[PDB]
Amino acid sequence: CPLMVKVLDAVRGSPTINVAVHVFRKAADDTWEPFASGKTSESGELHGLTTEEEFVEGIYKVEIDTKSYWKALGISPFHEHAEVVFTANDSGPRRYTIAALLSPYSYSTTAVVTN
Amino acid sequence: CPLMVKVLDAVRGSPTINVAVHVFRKAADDTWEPFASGKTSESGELHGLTTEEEFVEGIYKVEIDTKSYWKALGISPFHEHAEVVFTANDSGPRRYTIAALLSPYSYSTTAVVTNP
Numbered sequence: 001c002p003l004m005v006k007v008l009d010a011v012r013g014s015p016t017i018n019v020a021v022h023v024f025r026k027a028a029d030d031t032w033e034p035f036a037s038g039k040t041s042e043s044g045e046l047h048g049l050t051t052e053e054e055f056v057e058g059i060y061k062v063e064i065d066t067k068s069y070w071k072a073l074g075i076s077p078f079h080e081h082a083e084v085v086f087t088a089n090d091s092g093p094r095r096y097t098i099a100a101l102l103s104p105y106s107y108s109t110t111a112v113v114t115n
Numbered sequence: 116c117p118l119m120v121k122v123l124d125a126v127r128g129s130p131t132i133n134v135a136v137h138v139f140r141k142a143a144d145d146t147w148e149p150f151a152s153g154k155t156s157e158s159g160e161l162h163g164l165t166t167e168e169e170f171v172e173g174i175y176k177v178e179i180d181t182k183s184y185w186k187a188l189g190i191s192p193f194h195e196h197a198e199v200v201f202t203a204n205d206s207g208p209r210r211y212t213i214a215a216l217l218s219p220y221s222y223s224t225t226a227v228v229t230n231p
């Protein structure tokens with residue numbers, strides 16, 4: 001589909017399995033409208049969030065429930081969550097993969113945007 | 116100085132100067148109230164945002180205006196901003212350094228937490 005989320009664990013060297021991901025679209029009044037959500041698979045991936053026809057131009061937020069993940073492993077986390085906010089655009093590439101690499105006190109996020 | 120923000124440019128290998136940073140604290144009614152704001156210096160650091168008295172227990176949001184930084188260099192970046200949300204002082208007062216490393220399509224953020 002046009003949007004995919006992938007999550008990795010930098011402590012155990014593994015995909016992060018069963019972590020909650022919420023997607024939002026910015027409304028005209030500047031509040032975040034909930035859009036789609038799911039849990040990452042055994043491969044740390046979340047597919048099928050939206051479709052080409054639903055995923056119009058606009059500003060989107062992806063929120064990964066990183067705190068619940070670290071709590072499940074018995075490790076004290078710093079962040080409440082990891083959030084990515086971006087403008088989706090009709091001119092350039094259209095397939096978005098949002099990747100996040102997770103540590104208890106640090107995260108990195110990258111977008112891979114293709115054709 | 117219980118809260119400091121430090122920002123680095125991963126393309127040029129330099130501190131990022133004059134980057135806007137806005138800090139918010141979660142209120143009892145669950146809204147974000149304006150806490151402090153500032154811009155990074157020559158060294159890419161922002162000191163003096165708050166005091167040990169003012170910086171009580173709570174959930175804080177730090178929003179770094181990364182988009183304006185890149186657009187001022189001619190670059191249309193992926194992210195609208197970099198935002199760090201965290202519980203502070205839950206086991207007593209600490210000193211927090213929030214660091215962000217910036218690329219047009221990526222950022223990494225870390226916290227260094229020390230006991231004064």
Ligand SMILES: O=C(O)c1ccccc1Nc1cccc(C(F)(F)F)c1
Pocket residue numbers: 006008097098099100101108109110111112
């Ligand atoms: O590992 C994948 O398959 C991956 C895919 C898309 C985007 C990023 C991906 N990995 C990823 C994600 C975050 C940080 C790093 C690392 F810095 F380790 F290379 C690698």
Ligand SMILES: O=C(O)c1ccccc1Nc1cccc(C(F)(F)F)c1
Pocket residue numbers: 121123212213214215216223224225226227
């Ligand atoms: O660069 C500093 O002096 C620094 C200070 C405090 C916390 C982190 C700090 N540095 C930091 C922050 C994010 C990513 C990286 C890197 F990955 F490049 F090593 C280094």
